[PDB]
Amino acid sequence: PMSEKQLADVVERTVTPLMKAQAIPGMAVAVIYQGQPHYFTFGKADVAANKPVTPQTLFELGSVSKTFTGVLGGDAIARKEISLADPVTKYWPELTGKQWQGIRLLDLATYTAGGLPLQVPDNVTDNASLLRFYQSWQPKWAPGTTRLYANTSIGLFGSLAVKPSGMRFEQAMAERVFKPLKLNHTWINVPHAEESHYAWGYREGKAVHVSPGMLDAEAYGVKSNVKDMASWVMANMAPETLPPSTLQQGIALAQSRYWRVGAMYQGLGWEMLNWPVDVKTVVDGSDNKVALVPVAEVNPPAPPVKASWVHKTGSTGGFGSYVAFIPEKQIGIVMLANKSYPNPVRVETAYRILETLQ
Protein backbone atom coordinates (compact mmCIF):
# COMPACT_ATOMS: atom_id res chain seq x y z
CA PRO A 1 0.00 0.00 0.00
CA MET A 2 1.01 3.65 -0.41
CA SER A 3 2.45 5.44 2.59
CA GLU A 4 0.97 8.73 3.76
CA LYS A 5 3.96 10.58 2.27
CA GLN A 6 3.56 8.76 -1.06
CA LEU A 7 -0.15 9.62 -1.14
CA ALA A 8 0.53 13.26 -0.24
CA ASP A 9 2.97 13.44 -3.15
CA VAL A 10 0.41 11.99 -5.58
CA VAL A 11 -2.21 14.52 -4.47
CA GLU A 12 0.14 17.53 -4.42
CA ARG A 13 1.70 16.74 -7.81
CA THR A 14 -1.79 16.53 -9.35
CA VAL A 15 -3.58 19.39 -7.58
CA THR A 16 -0.84 22.04 -7.72
CA PRO A 17 -0.63 22.41 -11.55
CA LEU A 18 -4.41 22.00 -11.78
CA MET A 19 -5.03 24.94 -9.45
CA LYS A 20 -2.52 27.13 -11.29
CA ALA A 21 -3.94 26.35 -14.74
CA GLN A 22 -7.57 26.81 -13.66
CA ALA A 23 -6.93 29.79 -11.35
CA ILE A 24 -8.59 27.92 -8.46
CA PRO A 25 -7.64 29.86 -5.28
CA GLY A 26 -8.20 27.04 -2.79
CA MET A 27 -8.91 23.33 -2.60
CA ALA A 28 -9.55 20.76 0.11
CA VAL A 29 -9.16 17.07 -0.77
CA ALA A 30 -9.97 13.95 1.22
CA VAL A 31 -8.87 10.51 0.06
CA ILE A 32 -10.58 7.50 1.64
CA TYR A 33 -8.09 4.64 1.75
CA GLN A 34 -7.52 1.67 4.09
CA GLY A 35 -10.60 2.72 6.06
CA GLN A 36 -9.14 6.15 6.89
CA PRO A 37 -9.66 9.72 5.67
CA HIS A 38 -6.53 11.50 4.46
CA TYR A 39 -6.79 15.30 4.23
CA PHE A 40 -4.88 17.65 1.94
CA THR A 41 -5.45 21.40 1.79
CA PHE A 42 -4.14 23.95 -0.70
CA GLY A 43 -4.28 27.67 -1.27
CA LYS A 44 -6.69 30.30 -0.02
CA ALA A 45 -10.24 30.24 1.30
CA ASP A 46 -10.32 34.07 1.18
CA VAL A 47 -7.89 35.64 -1.29
CA ALA A 48 -8.32 39.27 -0.18
CA ALA A 49 -7.84 38.36 3.48
CA ASN A 50 -5.09 35.80 2.73
CA LYS A 51 -6.85 33.10 4.76
CA PRO A 52 -5.71 29.55 3.97
CA VAL A 53 -7.91 26.57 3.26
CA THR A 54 -7.95 24.25 6.29
CA PRO A 55 -9.92 21.05 7.02
CA GLN A 56 -12.47 23.33 8.73
CA THR A 57 -13.09 25.55 5.68
CA LEU A 58 -16.70 25.44 4.47
CA PHE A 59 -17.30 25.17 0.72
CA GLU A 60 -20.53 25.41 -1.24
CA LEU A 61 -21.24 21.89 -2.48
CA GLY A 62 -23.66 23.04 -5.18
CA SER A 63 -25.29 20.04 -6.84
CA VAL A 64 -23.40 17.57 -4.64
CA SER A 65 -26.28 18.55 -2.33
CA LYS A 66 -28.49 16.33 -4.51
CA THR A 67 -26.85 13.28 -2.90
CA PHE A 68 -28.10 14.44 0.51
CA THR A 69 -31.55 15.05 -0.96
CA GLY A 70 -31.61 11.59 -2.50
CA VAL A 71 -30.59 9.90 0.75
CA LEU A 72 -33.17 11.90 2.73
CA GLY A 73 -35.80 10.78 0.24
CA GLY A 74 -34.60 7.21 0.56
CA ASP A 75 -34.89 7.55 4.34
CA ALA A 76 -38.50 8.72 3.94
CA ILE A 77 -39.27 5.69 1.75
CA ALA A 78 -37.77 3.41 4.39
CA ARG A 79 -39.90 5.12 7.06
CA LYS A 80 -42.94 4.26 4.87
CA GLU A 81 -43.80 7.96 4.64
CA ILE A 82 -43.64 8.13 0.83
CA SER A 83 -43.42 5.80 -2.15
CA LEU A 84 -41.65 6.63 -5.40
CA ALA A 85 -44.77 5.30 -7.17
CA ASP A 86 -47.00 7.93 -5.52
CA PRO A 87 -48.44 10.65 -7.77
CA VAL A 88 -46.97 14.11 -7.36
CA THR A 89 -50.53 15.32 -6.71
CA LYS A 90 -50.74 13.24 -3.52
CA TYR A 91 -48.30 15.72 -1.97
CA TRP A 92 -49.23 18.88 -3.92
CA PRO A 93 -52.95 18.54 -4.67
CA GLU A 94 -53.03 22.08 -6.10
CA LEU A 95 -51.15 20.72 -9.16
CA THR A 96 -54.44 20.03 -10.92
CA GLY A 97 -53.21 20.33 -14.51
CA LYS A 98 -53.79 17.33 -16.75
CA GLN A 99 -50.08 17.21 -17.59
CA TRP A 100 -49.42 16.20 -13.97
CA GLN A 101 -51.58 13.08 -14.19
CA GLY A 102 -49.15 10.19 -14.50
CA ILE A 103 -46.15 11.99 -13.03
CA ARG A 104 -44.79 10.25 -9.92
CA LEU A 105 -42.35 11.11 -7.16
CA LEU A 106 -39.94 8.80 -9.02
CA ASP A 107 -40.00 11.11 -12.04
CA LEU A 108 -39.22 14.16 -9.92
CA ALA A 109 -36.44 12.38 -8.04
CA THR A 110 -34.69 11.10 -11.18
CA TYR A 111 -35.33 13.81 -13.81
CA THR A 112 -37.84 11.80 -15.87
CA ALA A 113 -40.97 13.96 -15.66
CA GLY A 114 -40.65 14.85 -19.36
CA GLY A 115 -38.57 18.01 -19.53
CA LEU A 116 -38.88 20.03 -16.33
CA PRO A 117 -36.25 22.75 -16.91
CA LEU A 118 -32.87 23.12 -15.23
CA GLN A 119 -33.62 26.23 -13.14
CA VAL A 120 -36.40 27.74 -11.11
CA PRO A 121 -36.60 31.25 -12.61
CA ASP A 122 -35.10 33.90 -10.33
CA ASN A 123 -38.37 35.87 -10.46
CA VAL A 124 -40.21 32.95 -8.82
CA THR A 125 -39.84 33.93 -5.16
CA ASP A 126 -42.86 32.54 -3.30
CA ASN A 127 -45.11 29.50 -3.29
CA ALA A 128 -47.92 31.19 -5.24
CA SER A 129 -45.48 31.95 -8.06
CA LEU A 130 -43.91 28.49 -7.79
CA LEU A 131 -47.37 26.95 -8.20
CA ARG A 132 -48.01 29.02 -11.34
CA PHE A 133 -44.62 27.91 -12.69
CA TYR A 134 -45.42 24.21 -12.38
CA GLN A 135 -49.03 24.61 -13.53
CA SER A 136 -47.86 26.39 -16.71
CA TRP A 137 -45.17 23.82 -17.55
CA GLN A 138 -45.83 21.76 -20.69
CA PRO A 139 -43.98 18.41 -20.97
CA LYS A 140 -42.21 17.49 -24.18
CA TRP A 141 -42.32 13.71 -23.66
CA ALA A 142 -44.32 11.16 -21.68
CA PRO A 143 -43.11 10.62 -18.09
CA GLY A 144 -40.60 7.90 -17.38
CA THR A 145 -39.08 7.95 -20.87
CA THR A 146 -36.49 10.77 -20.95
CA ARG A 147 -33.91 12.40 -18.68
CA LEU A 148 -33.30 16.12 -18.32
CA TYR A 149 -31.11 17.03 -15.35
CA ALA A 150 -33.05 19.67 -13.46
CA ASN A 151 -33.23 21.53 -10.16
CA THR A 152 -36.98 21.98 -10.71
CA SER A 153 -37.28 18.17 -10.71
CA ILE A 154 -35.19 16.86 -7.81
CA GLY A 155 -35.68 20.10 -5.87
CA LEU A 156 -39.44 19.59 -5.89
CA PHE A 157 -38.92 15.93 -5.00
CA GLY A 158 -37.04 16.93 -1.86
CA SER A 159 -39.67 19.48 -0.85
CA LEU A 160 -42.53 17.02 -1.27
CA ALA A 161 -40.67 14.05 0.24
CA VAL A 162 -40.50 15.72 3.67
CA LYS A 163 -44.17 16.71 3.84
CA PRO A 164 -45.30 13.57 5.77
CA SER A 165 -42.61 14.28 8.41
CA GLY A 166 -44.12 17.58 9.54
CA MET A 167 -40.69 19.23 9.24
CA ARG A 168 -39.34 21.74 6.78
CA PHE A 169 -36.69 20.33 4.45
CA GLU A 170 -33.78 21.88 6.38
CA GLN A 171 -35.03 20.52 9.72
CA ALA A 172 -35.66 17.06 8.29
CA MET A 173 -32.18 16.95 6.75
CA ALA A 174 -30.52 17.98 10.01
CA GLU A 175 -32.52 15.55 12.15
CA ARG A 176 -32.50 12.52 9.85
CA VAL A 177 -29.19 12.74 7.94
CA PHE A 178 -26.69 15.24 9.38
CA LYS A 179 -27.16 14.45 13.09
CA PRO A 180 -27.14 10.61 12.93
CA LEU A 181 -23.94 10.76 10.85
CA LYS A 182 -22.36 13.38 13.17
CA LEU A 183 -22.02 15.86 10.29
CA ASN A 184 -21.91 18.72 12.78
CA HIS A 185 -20.25 21.20 10.39
CA THR A 186 -22.60 20.72 7.45
CA TRP A 187 -25.15 23.46 6.89
CA ILE A 188 -28.01 24.50 4.67
CA ASN A 189 -27.74 27.97 6.20
CA VAL A 190 -24.31 28.82 7.61
CA PRO A 191 -24.79 30.06 11.20
CA HIS A 192 -23.39 33.45 12.13
CA ALA A 193 -20.97 31.73 14.53
CA GLU A 194 -19.53 29.65 11.65
CA GLU A 195 -19.06 32.45 9.09
CA SER A 196 -15.33 32.76 9.81
CA HIS A 197 -14.96 29.28 8.28
CA TYR A 198 -16.97 30.04 5.12
CA ALA A 199 -14.72 30.29 2.07
CA TRP A 200 -15.47 32.80 -0.64
CA GLY A 201 -16.17 31.48 -4.09
CA TYR A 202 -14.59 33.14 -7.12
CA ARG A 203 -16.28 33.92 -10.42
CA GLU A 204 -14.38 36.03 -12.96
CA GLY A 205 -12.00 36.87 -10.12
CA LYS A 206 -14.76 38.28 -7.86
CA ALA A 207 -15.68 36.92 -4.44
CA VAL A 208 -19.21 35.46 -4.47
CA HIS A 209 -21.59 33.30 -2.44
CA VAL A 210 -24.60 31.41 -3.79
CA SER A 211 -27.75 33.52 -4.20
CA PRO A 212 -31.01 32.54 -2.47
CA GLY A 213 -33.59 30.83 -4.64
CA MET A 214 -36.64 28.65 -4.38
CA LEU A 215 -35.72 24.97 -3.89
CA ASP A 216 -32.09 25.97 -3.21
CA ALA A 217 -31.71 23.80 -0.10
CA GLU A 218 -33.01 20.74 -1.97
CA ALA A 219 -31.06 21.18 -5.22
CA TYR A 220 -27.78 22.98 -4.51
CA GLY A 221 -27.69 24.57 -1.04
CA VAL A 222 -25.47 22.53 1.30
CA LYS A 223 -22.17 23.89 2.63
CA SER A 224 -19.64 21.60 4.32
CA ASN A 225 -15.98 21.07 5.17
CA VAL A 226 -13.66 18.37 3.91
CA LYS A 227 -13.91 16.32 7.12
CA ASP A 228 -17.69 16.03 7.12
CA MET A 229 -17.59 15.36 3.37
CA ALA A 230 -15.10 12.55 3.94
CA SER A 231 -17.51 11.13 6.53
CA TRP A 232 -20.37 11.43 4.01
CA VAL A 233 -18.39 9.47 1.42
CA MET A 234 -17.49 6.83 4.02
CA ALA A 235 -21.12 6.40 5.09
CA ASN A 236 -22.30 6.00 1.49
CA MET A 237 -19.44 3.68 0.52
CA ALA A 238 -19.75 1.38 3.55
CA PRO A 239 -23.28 1.74 4.98
CA GLU A 240 -23.02 -1.78 6.40
CA THR A 241 -20.71 -0.37 9.10
CA LEU A 242 -23.57 1.86 10.31
CA PRO A 243 -26.15 0.62 12.81
CA PRO A 244 -29.39 -0.70 11.28
CA SER A 245 -31.72 2.22 10.61
CA THR A 246 -33.97 3.83 8.04
CA LEU A 247 -30.97 6.02 7.14
CA GLN A 248 -28.92 2.93 6.26
CA GLN A 249 -31.85 1.69 4.17
CA GLY A 250 -32.16 5.11 2.53
CA ILE A 251 -28.49 5.06 1.53
CA ALA A 252 -29.16 1.76 -0.25
CA LEU A 253 -32.23 3.20 -1.99
CA ALA A 254 -30.24 6.21 -3.23
CA GLN A 255 -27.58 3.95 -4.84
CA SER A 256 -30.19 1.72 -6.43
CA ARG A 257 -30.36 1.87 -10.23
CA TYR A 258 -33.62 3.35 -11.58
CA TRP A 259 -32.71 4.28 -15.19
CA ARG A 260 -29.84 3.81 -17.63
CA VAL A 261 -28.50 6.44 -20.05
CA GLY A 262 -25.62 4.95 -21.97
CA ALA A 263 -23.13 3.75 -19.36
CA MET A 264 -24.63 5.84 -16.54
CA TYR A 265 -27.24 4.58 -14.08
CA GLN A 266 -29.39 7.13 -12.27
CA GLY A 267 -29.80 6.76 -8.51
CA LEU A 268 -31.47 9.18 -6.12
CA GLY A 269 -29.01 12.05 -6.49
CA TRP A 270 -26.09 9.66 -6.84
CA GLU A 271 -25.09 8.47 -10.30
CA MET A 272 -23.30 5.19 -10.97
CA LEU A 273 -21.36 3.33 -13.64
CA ASN A 274 -20.58 -0.38 -13.57
CA TRP A 275 -17.03 -1.03 -12.37
CA PRO A 276 -14.48 -1.67 -13.88
CA VAL A 277 -14.79 1.35 -16.20
CA ASP A 278 -12.30 3.51 -18.13
CA VAL A 279 -11.94 7.23 -17.35
CA LYS A 280 -13.19 8.28 -20.79
CA THR A 281 -16.40 6.33 -20.19
CA VAL A 282 -16.89 8.09 -16.84
CA VAL A 283 -16.31 11.49 -18.48
CA ASP A 284 -18.71 10.67 -21.33
CA GLY A 285 -21.27 9.38 -18.82
CA SER A 286 -21.32 12.46 -16.58
CA ASP A 287 -22.40 15.28 -18.91
CA ASN A 288 -25.80 16.65 -17.96
CA LYS A 289 -26.78 17.81 -21.43
CA VAL A 290 -28.85 20.91 -22.13
CA ALA A 291 -31.15 18.77 -24.32
CA LEU A 292 -33.33 15.81 -23.36
CA VAL A 293 -32.14 12.24 -23.94
CA PRO A 294 -34.05 8.94 -23.83
CA VAL A 295 -33.70 6.57 -20.86
CA ALA A 296 -33.90 2.82 -20.40
CA GLU A 297 -35.98 1.64 -17.45
CA VAL A 298 -34.54 -0.55 -14.69
CA ASN A 299 -37.65 -2.39 -13.52
CA PRO A 300 -37.62 -3.31 -10.75
CA PRO A 301 -34.94 -0.88 -9.57
CA ALA A 302 -31.73 -2.79 -9.06
CA PRO A 303 -30.23 -2.81 -5.52
CA PRO A 304 -26.80 -1.22 -5.01
CA VAL A 305 -23.92 -2.85 -6.89
CA LYS A 306 -20.63 -2.93 -4.99
CA ALA A 307 -18.81 -3.00 -8.36
CA SER A 308 -19.73 0.60 -9.15
CA TRP A 309 -18.09 3.95 -9.68
CA VAL A 310 -20.46 6.14 -7.63
CA HIS A 311 -20.16 9.90 -7.98
CA LYS A 312 -21.69 13.35 -8.16
CA THR A 313 -20.45 16.65 -9.58
CA GLY A 314 -21.74 19.95 -8.32
CA SER A 315 -21.18 23.67 -8.68
CA THR A 316 -22.41 27.09 -7.69
CA GLY A 317 -21.38 30.34 -9.33
CA GLY A 318 -18.18 30.41 -7.31
CA PHE A 319 -17.48 26.78 -6.31
CA GLY A 320 -16.82 23.38 -7.87
CA SER A 321 -17.08 20.13 -5.90
CA TYR A 322 -16.80 16.43 -6.71
CA VAL A 323 -17.22 13.18 -4.76
CA ALA A 324 -16.55 9.67 -6.08
CA PHE A 325 -16.08 6.23 -4.56
CA ILE A 326 -15.79 2.55 -5.53
CA PRO A 327 -17.32 0.26 -2.88
CA GLU A 328 -15.67 -2.88 -4.31
CA LYS A 329 -12.24 -1.33 -3.71
CA GLN A 330 -13.08 0.68 -0.55
CA ILE A 331 -11.54 3.84 -1.99
CA GLY A 332 -13.04 7.26 -2.53
CA ILE A 333 -12.30 10.96 -2.89
CA VAL A 334 -13.71 14.41 -2.06
CA MET A 335 -12.49 17.48 -3.96
CA LEU A 336 -13.82 20.88 -2.83
CA ALA A 337 -12.74 24.00 -4.75
CA ASN A 338 -13.66 27.68 -4.52
CA LYS A 339 -13.81 28.14 -8.28
CA SER A 340 -15.97 26.22 -10.74
CA TYR A 341 -13.84 24.30 -13.26
CA PRO A 342 -14.95 21.78 -15.88
CA ASN A 343 -16.61 18.58 -14.69
CA PRO A 344 -14.53 16.34 -17.02
CA VAL A 345 -11.39 17.73 -15.37
CA ARG A 346 -12.80 16.83 -11.94
CA VAL A 347 -13.38 13.25 -13.12
CA GLU A 348 -9.93 12.96 -14.70
CA THR A 349 -8.22 14.32 -11.58
CA ALA A 350 -10.15 12.01 -9.24
CA TYR A 351 -9.67 8.95 -11.45
CA ARG A 352 -5.91 9.49 -11.66
CA ILE A 353 -5.55 9.80 -7.87
CA LEU A 354 -7.73 6.77 -7.17
CA GLU A 355 -5.81 4.72 -9.77
CA THR A 356 -2.64 5.06 -7.66
CA LEU A 357 -4.38 3.24 -4.79
CA GLN A 358 -5.00 0.16 -6.96
Known catalytic membership, residue 220: no
The 3-class secondary structure across 65-82, one letter per residue, is: HHHHHHHHHHHHHHCCCC
Of 102, 105, 232, residue with least CA distance to 178: 232
352: region left, alpha or beta (phi > 0 left; psi from -120 to 50 alpha): alpha
Active-site residue among 63, 159, 256, 286? 63
DSSP string for residues in 149-175: --HHHHHHHHHHHTGGGTS-HHHHHII
Contact indicator for 61, 225 with CB cutoff of 8 Å: no
Of 144, 111, 146, 141, residue with least CA distance to 294: 146
Q: Where is 28: in which H helix or E strand?
A: strand 26-33
Active-site residue among 91, 111, 149, 341? 149
Which technique was used to obtain these atomic coordinates? X-ray
Amino acid at site 66: K
Known catalytic membership, residue 111: no
In the chain, where the domains are located:
1-358
Of 109, 70, 68, 145, residue with least CA distance to 299: 145
Give me the half-sphere count of Cα atoms (radius 13 Å) on the Cβ side of residue 297. Answer: 7
Q: How far is CA 242 from the centre of its chain?
A: 21
Of 222, 216, 189, 199, residue with least CA distance to 312: 222
Superfamily name and number for 1-358: DD-peptidase/beta-lactamase superfamily (3.40.710.10)
What are the C-alpha distances in Å from 18 to residues 13, 23, 115, 199, 347?
9, 8, 35, 19, 13
Contact indicator for 45, 201 with CB cutoff of 8 Å: no
Amino acid at site 302: A
Give the neighbor-by-neighbor strand order of the sheet with 59-60. 59-60, 223-224, 186-187
DSSP string for residues in 129-141: HHHHHHHH---SS
